[PDB]
Write a protein that binds this ligand. Structure first.
Ligand SMILES: [Cl-]
Ligand SMILES: [Cl-]
Length: 162
């Protein structure tokens, strides 16, 4: 298992514009299009992202292409962030994937806001970090996905995904 296969299980794959768990316009593998309520505005972003007139539909390759761009952006956002970088640097490879997963879903700002959890991860206090991570809107709104990520941080294995 790797970061790509982990995120593919978490986000699924859809080739036509759809609404995410928050109600926003998305396409492919969890690629947010816009927070706007207008479908037209979403179709406009989609064509801009792809470079062709898509009329709301993309192929598998186009989806995988946006996906590779998005994982690359998440990693780099972490390495550029003064709060995330040190945590990232301190973790093993499995746990690193779990941090990337959080960032992909919620953005760097968002993750950076989990001050207490990040400090516990840095300290390698696994059971205490899992407990604090669960006291969030994240966990209450997407509980099965949060539990998978949280178990990954707690154990340091891919069990939750096998
Ligand atoms: Cl883009
Ligand atoms: Cl969920």
């Amino acid at each position: 298992m790797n970061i790509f296969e982990m995120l593919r299980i978490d986000e699924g794959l859809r080739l036509k514009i759809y609404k995410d768990t928050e109600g926003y316009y998305t396409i492919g593998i969890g690629h947010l299009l816009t927070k706007s309520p207008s479908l037209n505005s979403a179709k406009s972003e989609l064509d801009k992202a792809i470079g062709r007139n898509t009329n709301g539909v993309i192929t598998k390759d186009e989806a995988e292409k946006l996906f590779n761009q998005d994982v690359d952006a998440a990693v780099r956002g972490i390495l550029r962030n003064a709060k995330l970088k040190p945590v990232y640097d301190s973790l093993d490879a499995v746990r690193r994937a779990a941090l990337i997963n959080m960032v992909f879903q919620m953005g760097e700002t968002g993750v950076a806001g989990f001050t207490n959890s990040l400090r516990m991860l840095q300290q390698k206090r696994w059971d205490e970090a899992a407990v604090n991570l669960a006291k969030s809107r994240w966990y209450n709104q997407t509980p099965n996905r949060a539990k998978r990520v949280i178990t990954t941080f707690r154990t340091g294995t891919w069990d939750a995904y096998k």
